[PDB]
Amino acid sequence: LIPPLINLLMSIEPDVIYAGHDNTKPDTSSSLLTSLNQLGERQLLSVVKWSKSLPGFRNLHIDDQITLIQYSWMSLMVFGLGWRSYKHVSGQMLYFAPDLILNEQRMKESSFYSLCLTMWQIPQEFVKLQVSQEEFLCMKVLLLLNTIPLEGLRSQTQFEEMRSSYIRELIKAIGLRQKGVVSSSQRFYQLTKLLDNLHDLVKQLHLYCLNTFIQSRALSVEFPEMMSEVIAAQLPKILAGMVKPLLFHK
Numbered sequence: 001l002i003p004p005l006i007n008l009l010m011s012i013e014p015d016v017i018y019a020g021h022d023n024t025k026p027d028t029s030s031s032l033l034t035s036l037n038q039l040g041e042r043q044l045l046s047v048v049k050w051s052k053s054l055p056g057f058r059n060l061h062i063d064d065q066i067t068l069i070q071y072s073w074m075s076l077m078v079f080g081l082g083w084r085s086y087k088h089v090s091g092q093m094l095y096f097a098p099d100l101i102l103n104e105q106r107m108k109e110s111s112f113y114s115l116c117l118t119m120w121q122i123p124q125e126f127v128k129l130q131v132s133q134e135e136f137l138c139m140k141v142l143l144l145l146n147t148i149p150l151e152g153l154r155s156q157t158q159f160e161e162m163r164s165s166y167i168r169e170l171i172k173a174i175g176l177r178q179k180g181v182v183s184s185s186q187r188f189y190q191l192t193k194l195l196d197n198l199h200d201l202v203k204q205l206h207l208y209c210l211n212t213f214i215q216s217r218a219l220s221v222e223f224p225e226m227m228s229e230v231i232a233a234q235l236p237k238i239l240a241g242m243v244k245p246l247l248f249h250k
């Protein structure tokens with residue numbers, strides 16, 4: 001049977017989030033990017049709502065909760081993109097939302113296409129490894145908790161215990177399917193290495209974001225208010241490497 005924390009994680013997953021994308025026009029660069037940012041705004045709200053129901057998270061110092069969301073939001077979004085792409089279209093298109101699904105044809109602009117190829121690595125890996133829902137849900141919590149400030153968190157003890165609890169839960173999720181301690185251990189290595197490797201992937205998205213944000217008026221790309229604040233609050237600092245990514249492996 002499914003362990004209870006994993007069932008709970010299933011229960012607190014967000015409902016379907018639409019981009020509000022007007023698929024009557026053809027997209028220019030600016031309209032496509034504006035629509036993705038609009039979806040991003042809706043997804044950021046969803047992430048904060050999700051965190052309020054995530055066992056353990058609400059008990060961290062509020063400053064730590066805000067910090068962790070501000071550090072991890074891009075990571076959580078691209079990881080979720082990967083999941084939806086894996087689930088709905090077998091990793092072969094990028095399933096941003098049910099009203100915003102991009103195939104290669106719709107990826108005209110050079111830099112955005114390159115960004116998409118980077119993002120595509122996640123669903124490709126989900127397909128290759130045959131990641132389960134139970135594994136995904138635990139890994140997703142670990143991503144929220146995968147980067148801390150250089151000086152640590154105010155609730156560092158609580159945070160460490162929470163992170164340990166979800167590591168143990170990933171081990172249970174793996175154990176649902178991987179039988180044998182070697183197969184299970186090898187799988188744990190694989191899934192945690194994927195998370196380690198996400199730090200490098202997300203750096204590329206961070207840079208793209210800040211570039212687009214700084215150039216937003218010139219590119220005619222709208223950045224809604226909540227996303228603008230998360231970007232302004234932490235992205236330059238994160239990009240400068242003044243944070244501590246946590247790694248499972250050396």
Ligand SMILES: Cc1noc(C)c1-c1ccc(CNS(=O)(=O)c2c(C)nn(C)c2Cl)cc1
Pocket residue numbers: 032033034036037039040043074077078081096205208209210212213
């Ligand atoms: C939505 C969504 N799903 O996965 C990802 C990644 C996103 C996402 C994440 C961040 C942002 C912020 N704007 S941006 O960084 O210029 C950008 C745009 C536009 N599209 N994407 C994929 C990015 Cl990153 C917009 C969309």
